[PDB]
Amino acid sequence: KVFGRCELAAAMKRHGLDNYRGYSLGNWVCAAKFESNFNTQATNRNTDGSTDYGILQINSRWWCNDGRTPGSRNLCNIPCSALLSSDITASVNCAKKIVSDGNGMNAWVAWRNRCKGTDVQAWIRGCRL
Ligand SMILES: [Cl-]
Ligand SMILES: [Cl-]
Ligand SMILES: [Cl-]
Ligand SMILES: [Cl-]
Ligand SMILES: [Kr]
Ligand code: NA
């Protein structure tokens, strides 16, 4: 499913991401934009054999099982496929564990290269929230 901007914002808020671990709603929306263009079905294979899945491009090396990432962990205890659903619940639940890990949203390369230090409030400006 391909979310619209405010739609996703609303969905993320509902799921508790606004200011989660101090990251305001517009960081999550910005990260989703550039990670997956808001497409729950996005997948990208990495050089190490791992794969990133879903709207927040969560990686199979640590967070989900895809049966093809040898020696990987499944810290969110979930099939990577769950992450591709049009219901963002699984991605959100897993994202909270990742941003709680230790380096916050820096875990999302697109986020620190394209969102961090920018006016991320602009991603929700306009939305009925
Ligand atoms: Cl914001
Ligand atoms: Cl695996
Ligand atoms: Cl949803
Ligand atoms: Cl942080
Ligand atoms: Kr998400
Ligand atoms: Na894994």
Swiss-Prot record:
Question: InterPro entries this protein is in?
Answer: Glyco_hydro_22, Glyco_hydro_22_CS, Glyco_hydro_22_lys, Lysozyme-like_dom_sf
Q: Would the keyword Signal turn up in this protein's UniProt record? A: yes
Domain C-type lysozyme, residue spans: 1-129
Q: Which UniProt keywords apply?
A: Allergen, Antimicrobial, Bacteriolytic enzyme, Disulfide bond, Glycosidase, Hydrolase, Secreted, Signal
Reactions catalysed, semicolon-separated, are: Hydrolysis of (1->4)-beta-linkages between N-acetylmuramic acid and N-acetyl-D-glucosamine residues in a peptidoglycan and between N-acetyl-D-glucosamine residues in chitodextrins
Pfam families under this entry?
Lys
Kindly list the places in or outside the cell where this protein is found, as annotated in its UniProt entry: Secreted
Q: Which GO terms describe its molecular function?
A: beta-N-acetylglucosaminidase activity; identical protein binding; lysozyme activity
Cysteine pairs forming cystine bridges in this chain are 6-127, 30-115, 64-80, 76-94
> Where does the UniProt entry say this protein principally localizes?
secreted
Q: Where is the active site?
A: 35, 52
Q: What else is known?
A: Lysozyme C is capable of both hydrolysis and transglycosylation; it also shows a slight esterase activity. It acts rapidly on both peptide-substituted and unsubstituted peptidoglycan, and slowly on chitin oligosaccharides.
Q: What does this protein do?
A: Lysozymes have primarily a bacteriolytic function; those in tissues and body fluids are associated with the monocyte-macrophage system and enhance the activity of immunoagents. Has bacteriolytic activity against M.luteus.
Family to which the UniProt record says this protein belongs: Belongs to the glycosyl hydrolase 22 family.
Protein name in the entry: Lysozyme C
